[PDB]
Write a protein that binds this ligand. Structure first.
Ligand SMILES: [Ca+2]
Ligand SMILES: [Ca+2]
Ligand SMILES: [Ca+2]
Ligand SMILES: [Cl-]
Ligand code: NA
Ligand code: NA
Ligand code: NA
Lengths: 4, 473
């Protein structure tokens, strides 16, 4: 997997 | 007479108001009396600097939690690289304090703002679920500027706990009116990513928000797809202005960018709308966005008029949000009828894809039954198929009223041989259309390679009602  | 904010950087917030008409029409909502009073927004991200001089006045511990470290305090972890600045930047877009001599203002500068610290660690299904499901009778609106990797080869979405959190939120959250989930549609533009390969944006339970540059263009990072609902301004090239917000270490930044900035602005506009009518359901809010968003002067080569006369683009959904129009329409809004779901299993046998496959089916949309739909909301084509190189596929779905939704564009980086396993491709582009009649699914190989595969299941899932239509635009 989870990215900003 | 409404007096606009005096904050030092408010004049740099070109996207909130201006004489140029390239803005989100937020001042008009403020002038009608709506600044977010009484609404609670939570930023699900890497933390929130609750003591920031432009957030402390609006900070709400009840809207906050630290899921990464299992404590109540969402304060970011400070590092030299300032990695955990992202949530604070998103929060100030929603609800930075106004008229306090610091930085700029949030869209909903009198709303209450919290943060869930959940990205600064291993982001499991359980972490996501505990964040999406936080205090659902206190938090009204959740904003998420994160998701699966934008490498242009990933197909991923909420696992079981997170999907359960979405269903529990929209069903029982906010007193049964439903939690409002706002999602950034993605930063995978350079990789030719598709936001329908992201189950969070592609969910019917989220309002997926894309971006436009100051000059009205499709930013480099933008992902096109049929599940996007609407657009807010964000960054573009270096001649175009960017987003002004609260930064880590009690600073002010004028250079917040990308998809991350669009969802919080939408969350703020939705907060103003909820103040104008607190009885709006999660579905009401999507209807308001569809009806009030503005295509004008957004440049795209795929603008199309749907069956009820509304312009829609895969880059922008129904266009730019219009806060003044949202709050105005919310005030006397009549709650929509309960959501019906009509399930149509299309195939009678598997179909080889080859170079091109077209599947035509005439449907009655559950005629004569309690789930009869004459007024569509979301539609899904839930597809199960094998293919040797997934990114060479392009998939389109045409509604009975002639609206062609791109469910999947070619993804050059997607070499996967894993196909799609009941993947629920979603389109918003046929909203308010009558779904009775002929639907067409097109699957094609966009490359010269001799690719091969089989479509084994196509479920057409229609959501909507049987009442209350407007005269087409
Ligand atoms: Ca903590
Ligand atoms: Ca301020
Ligand atoms: Ca993506
Ligand atoms: Cl469902
Ligand atoms: Na409910
Ligand atoms: Na969505
Ligand atoms: Na029809």
């Amino acid at each position: 997997x989870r990215v900003x | 007479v409404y007096q606009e904010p005096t904050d030092p950087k408010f004049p740099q917030q070109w996207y909130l108001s201006g004489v140029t008409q390239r803005d989100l029409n937020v001042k008009a909502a403020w002038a009608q009396g709506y600044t977010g009073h009484g609404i609670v927004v939570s930023i699900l991200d890497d933390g929130i600097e609750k003591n920031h001089p432009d957030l402390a006045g609006n900070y709400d511990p009840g809207a906050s939690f630290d899921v990464n470290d299992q404590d109540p305090d969402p304060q970011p972890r400070y590092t030299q690289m300032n990695d955990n600045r992202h949530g604070t930047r998103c929060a100030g877009e929603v609800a930075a304090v106004a008229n306090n001599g610091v930085c700029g203002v949030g869209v909903a500068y009198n709303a209450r703002i919290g943060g869930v610290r959940m990205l600064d660690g291993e982001v499991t299904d359980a972490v996501e679920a505990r964040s999406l499901g936080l205090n659902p009778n206190h938090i009204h609106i959740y904003s998420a500027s994160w998701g699966p990797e934008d490498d242009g080869k990933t197909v991923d979405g909420p696992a079981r706990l997170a999907e359960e959190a979405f269903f529990r939120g929209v069903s029982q959250g906010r007193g049964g009116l439903g939690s409002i989930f706002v999602w950034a549609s993605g930063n995978g533009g350079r990789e030719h990513d598709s936001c329908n390969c992201d189950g969070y944006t592609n969910s019917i339970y989220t309002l997926s928000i894309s971006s436009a540059t100051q000059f009205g263009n499709v930013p480099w990072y933008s992902e096109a797809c049929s599940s996007t609902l609407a657009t807010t301004y964000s960054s573009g090239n270096q001649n175009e202005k960017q987003i002004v917000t609260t930064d880590l270490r009690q600073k002010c930044t004028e250079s917040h960018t990308g998809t991350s900035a669009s969802a919080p602005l939408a969350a703020g506009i939705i907060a103003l709308t909820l103040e104008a009518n607190k009885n709006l359901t999660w579905r009401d809010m999507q209807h308001l966005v569809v009806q009030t968003s503005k295509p004008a002067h957004l440049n795209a080569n795929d603008w199309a008029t749907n069956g009820v006369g509304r312009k829609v683009s895969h880059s922008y959904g129904y266009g730019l949000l219009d806060a003044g129009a949202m709050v105005a329409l919310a005030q006397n809004w009549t709650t929509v009828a309960p959501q019906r779901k009509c399930i149509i299993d299309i195939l009678t046998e598997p179909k080889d894809i080859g170079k091109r496959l077209e599947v035509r089916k005439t449907v009655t949309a559950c005629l004569g039954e309690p789930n009869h739909i004459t007024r569509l909301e979301h539609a899904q084509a839930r597809l199960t198929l094998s293919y040797n190189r997934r990114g060479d596929l392009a998939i389109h779905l045409v509604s009975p009223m002639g609206t062609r939704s791109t469910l999947l564009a070619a993804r050059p980086h997607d070499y996967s041989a894993d196909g799609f396993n009941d993947w629920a491709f979603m389109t918003t582009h046929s909203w308010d259309e009558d779904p009775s009649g002929e639907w067409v699914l097109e699957i094609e190989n966009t490359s010269e390679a001799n690719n091969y595969g089989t479509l084994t299941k196509f479920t057409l899932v229609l959501y909507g009602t049987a009442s209350g239509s407007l005269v087409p635009r």
